[PDB]
Every structure is written in C-alpha cells, then in structure tokens.
Ligand binder design. Structure first.
Ligand SMILES: Nc1ncnc2c1ncn2[C@@H]1O[C@H](COP(=O)(O)OP(=O)(O)NP(=O)(O)O)[C@@H](O)[C@H]1O
Ligand SMILES: Nc1ncnc2c1ncn2[C@@H]1O[C@H](COP(=O)(O)OP(=O)(O)NP(=O)(O)O)[C@@H](O)[C@H]1O
Ligand SMILES: [Mn+2]
Ligand SMILES: [Mn+2]
Ligand SMILES: [Mn+2]
Ligand SMILES: [Mn+2]
Lengths: 307, 307
C-alpha cells in the first residue's frame, strides 16, 4: 500500500543480498565510514502493481552497519526477514516535525529522520562504533542497525532502523519517557487519553511509580547508564530519554519469561515485588542554561533516584 | 573477471527475481512490447571486489521474454541458474563487427549485438511472438529468451540470449553453416585450421556430407523449415543460416541418447546410417539481385537437396 514502505522493504532486501556476497573482514577501514551504495530504478510500462515505477534507494555506510548488526547479535538473514517477510506497521507514539513503524515481528523500530539528523549520524558514527567495540556491545544506547534514503516521485525521506526497547513477545502495559528535566515535564491531559500513553517525569513522580529490581541488577544498570551518558555528553549530545516499559505478567494471563538474547533490555523484578513485572529500559533519541554536561548530571541523578 | 559479464549475471539475476514477484497473466498487452526496466547502481567506496562501482542494466520487454521463455519450455528459476550459478564462457566461432558466450551448463548462447539489431528486434518482436503462439513453439527459428543493455564505465553493449542449437550434453564434432547461396561460399584455408571449424555450403558439397535421417523426420523437418523461412521472407529478413551439428556416438565412447525437451533440435540417424549419429539443426542469425523472396527459395532448395 504505502509506496515509501515498499521501497524500504525492497531496498533492505537488496542491501542484505548484496552484502551476503561480500567478504566481511573483522575490521572497518576509514573509508567504510564515508561509503554508500545507490540504486535508481526506472520501470516503463512494467511491474506497476508491486513497486513505484520510479524510485531511488541509498544505503549509508553499508559495511559499518553490517558490522554493528553482528556486534548487536543480529544475523543479516534474520534482519532481512524481520523487515521484508511482511510489511512494517505504523505505530502509536511519535513526535512529527516523524513517522514510526515497527517491524512485523516487533523486533525493530523504523524512524523517519531529517537530513540534518543523517549529517549528525555521519558525524558521530566512527566514535559510536568505537564506543560499541569498547563495551562489547553491552550498552543502553540506541542500537543503530541501518540508515537509508528513499526517493519516490518527488518525496525524499531518510530512515534509521534501531532495536525495539520493548520485548518482541511480552506486551507492555505502561510506558515512560524520562529526562530528569529541572523544567516541569508532564504528559498533557489529552496525552493521557492515549491507549498506551507516553508518560513523563512528572507522571512518574506523581503516581509514585516504583521499579522493583534487586540491588545487583540496579548497580549493573546504573554503571552502564553512567558510561553511556558520559559518552553522549562528550559528543555534546542531549535531549535523550530513558524509555521505560513495564510488562505485567498477571495481566498477560514461556510463562512470563523472555529470551535475553532477543529482548536485550529486559530486567525481571525482584522476589518481593508487589506484582510479577518485567522492565524494559534503554536510552533513545540521541541525535540532537541547559548544556550537555549539566543535562548528563541531571539525567543520571533522576534515574538513580527512581530506582 | 570480465566486468561486463559480471553485470550481465547480476542483471539477469535481478531481472528474474523481480519477475518472480509479478502476477503473470496468460496474455501480453500491446504496451508489454514497448516496456523496459532500468537499474543504475553507484557504489562509492564499497563492494569493489565483486562488481564495477558504477554500472547500468536495462531489460527490454521483460514480460514478453518471460512469456517466450515459458513457451519454449524454459522455467525462470532454471534460466536464472544457467546464467548466474557460474560464469558464461567465451567460445570459438564468431564474426566480430560480436562476442559469443555459452552458459556454463551449455544450454544458452549469449551474443553481443548492435543498437541497430536491438531496434530491429523491437520492430519484429510482436510478429515473432505471434508466430511462436501460432506454431505452439514448434519451430526452427532462433529462440529469443532475453535482451539486455549493459553499461560499465564508458562501454555500452547490447546482449541477446538464445537457445544453443547443440546439445548441452552430447558433444558435436562437426559443424556446418549453410545458406544455399548462388554466390560461391566456402570456409577459407585458415578457417579449416580451426578446432571446431564453421564449414559452409561448398565444404558440404565438396566433402559429400550426408545426413542420414528417415523419411518421416525429414518431412517433418522440411515442413517446419518451410513455414519458418516464409515467415522470415515476409518480414524481409535474410542472411540467416541453417546451423548443422553432428554428434558421433562412436567417437564419444544415456549412451548416445538425448533429452528431447532440453536438446530440442536433436534428430537421431536412421537404422542404416554408416555411423551412429545425432544431428542438431536450426535457423540462426535472422536480424539483418539477392532479395528476401529469392533468398527464401534458394535456402529451401539447397536444404531439401542436402537431406
Ligand atoms: N527504540 C524504541 N523502541 C520502542 N519504542 C520507541 C523506540 N524509540 C522511540 N520509541 C517510541 O516513540 C516515541 C518517540 O521516540 P523519539 O525517538 O523520542 O521520537 P522524536 O520524534 O525524536 N521525539 P522528541 O523527543 O519530541 O524529539 C517514544 O516515546 C517511544 O514511545
Ligand atoms: N544458437 C546457437 N547455438 C550454437 N552455436 C551458435 C548459435 N548461434 C551462433 N552460433 C555459433 O556462432 C557462429 C556465428 O553465429 P552468427 O549469429 O551467424 O554470428 P554473426 O556475428 O551474426 N555472423 P555473420 O553471418 O557473419 O553476421 C555460428 O557459425 C555458430 O558456430
Ligand atoms: Mn525523544
Ligand atoms: Mn527527537
Ligand atoms: Mn551468421
Ligand atoms: Mn549476423
């Protein structure tokens, strides 16, 4: 139906098949971070039912994102399947300026970004990759899995693919987006009316939300969060959130258990939790008085407070 | 190695995969005969080992050639395999103005043609297709299976794929190219020095070559040949040949037998043949005092004479 979506599927499929024939070395070279592949298709009086007649697809830094996908435990054939076997679905939460889709198997998020975001991604990509190498892919940062430019009849859009913070199986009933902002930050009364609303710093403090995780999990989490946010501060990045999803095992009734190699952000509640819960927490949205260094401290203070 | 060959393989592979997703109706529409699909690829600092960095691939009338392939008993998946699993090999006989390749499994011939040949193919394609429908694909005419334009760094070439006249298994030890020309037509003394030489009308009359086929096979063959050549005359085509290949079952030692659904042009010798032979005969090269109407009669007179 959506031709821009059909071009994405076609292009991801094309991209992965091309790479399937490439010898993948253990290392990237500097030029890999400046590389791209472009395809321009023109069908005249042919194949009108499946594809736009005229479209372009561009993949940025194919070798870098192939390297990242493997580092994040993602097999190319699986990634291809998740994005092409059936169409991605549009989804509830957003902030248009921006359209979100989820892969059909709920493993990946596809976000539409600006050309300025693309330029910033290129700017930080090497440092990001080096950070991912240093931590062996154990991080709360968004996992950037692919970045693309699509052209269909006058319309150009840029797309980034990331890992879903939430489980691909275990449904989430409650969702928070936290910054630790000194300035008052709350969901509006029209916002709370949403089905799965994106609640914020005030809603969390207001409704006395607690997260019941044991001491070891909390320390591990916060240690990771500390390194990640300092890296972000170092890059002068800000306006990022901690996304928090809560799975209620009671409401849902593998009976409340998750695959930690797929749902990488999952943390089980401790044994004395008022309710059987699984949390899914990760950093999102990194690409944009309040300065990065301060923002970094504010964010970390608040998160340590709420755990 | 040969980048133009690698682009062909890449493009045929691409073409067949695209069509694999198309609903194929039983009929062609007029626009199918004017259709094409174009792909332009630009790789910057990427994938230098497998492909040229910059290339174009164009397929003419994809639906028509898909329809023809099925009419000629050829499955798209098989055709794809024959042309992509391993590289086509360059081959002995030619006439440069023109490079020939054979598919690795010896099922298909790939000939390089001019843009004027491409223009003439478009001119006759509908009438050709209609002729193929009328005879249910039972014909000695070349079987046109695909036509393409390749671009690699300044070099543009046009390619047509046809069925090999000869067997994909049974080797041929002797080869003739016959026109029935009133003007003397012979292989040169430098030509006969070739390993598998392309002998001609004089060599055949000179060396008293006989073809030992029974009366029914001869009549069937000549009846077909009659209709085919009249069709060609009707299109004002000329300078076409009967290609004759001879398989010697003795020299070769399925013990001398062939699959008639693959080696469609094969005709076994009759029981009293001085030697166990299989012949492979078909019309080739149709795309260009001596006028088409006369040429047609001359050609038919000579061929009926030699059988
Ligand atoms: N990786 C992810 N997994 C699951 N949900 C996500 C993910 N990223 C974003 N979302 C959802 O989409 C919403 C918006 O994400 P975000 O990337 O902040 O969009 P944005 O348009 O950049 N918003 P803003 O902060 O106003 O710039 C979030 O609150 C989540 O509900
Ligand atoms: N379908 C085929 N199967 C097997 N061999 C072929 C086939 N087509 C051509 N050849 C071989 O290639 C030679 C030249 O074929 P042809 O298509 O006549 O080339 P050309 O360059 O058009 N020659 P000319 O008659 O001088 O214009 C033939 O004599 C055969 O040996
Ligand atoms: Mn955000
Ligand atoms: Mn944002
Ligand atoms: Mn010829
Ligand atoms: Mn010719």
């Amino acid at each position: 139906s959506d031709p821009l979506l059909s071009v994405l599927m076609w292009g991801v499929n094309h991209s992965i098949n091309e790479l399937s024939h490439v010898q993948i070395p253990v290392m990237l070279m500097p030029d890999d971070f400046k590389a791209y592949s472009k395809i321009k298709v023109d069908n005249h009086l042919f194949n009108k039912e499946n594809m736009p007649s005229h479209f372009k697809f561009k993949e940025y830094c194919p070798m870098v994102f192939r390297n990242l996908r493997e580092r994040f435990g993602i097999d190319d054939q699986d990634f291809q399947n998740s994005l092409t076997r059936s169409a991605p679905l549009p989804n509830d939460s957003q902030a248009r300026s921006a359209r979100f889709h989820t892969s059909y198997d709920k493993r990946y998020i596809i976000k539409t970004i600006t050309s300025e975001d693309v330029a910033e991604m290129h700017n930080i990509l090497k440092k990001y990759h080096q950070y991912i190498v240093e931590c062996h892919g154990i991080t709360l940062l968004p996992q950037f899995l692919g970045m693309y430019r699509l052209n269909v009849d006058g319309v150009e859009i840029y797309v980034i693919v990331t890992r879903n913070v939430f489980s691909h199986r275990l449904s989430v009933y409650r969702k928070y987006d936290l910054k630790g902002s000194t300035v008052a930050r709350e969901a509006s009364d029209k916002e709370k009316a949403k089905e799965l609303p994106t609640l914020k710093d005030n809603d969390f403090i207001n409704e006395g939300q607690k997260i019941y995780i044991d001491d070891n999990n909390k320390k591990v989490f916060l240690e990771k969060l500390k390194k990640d946010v300092e890296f972000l501060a170092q890059l002068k990045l800000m306006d990022y959130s901690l996304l928090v999803g809560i799975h209620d095992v009671e409401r849902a009734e593998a009976p409340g258990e998750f695959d930690p190699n797929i749902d990488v952000y999952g943390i089980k509640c401790h044994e004395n939790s008022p309710r059987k819960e699984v949390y899914f927490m990760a950093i999102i949205d990194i690409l944009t008085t309040v300065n990065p260094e301060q923002y970094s401290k504010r964010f970390l203070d608040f998160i340590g407070h709420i755990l």
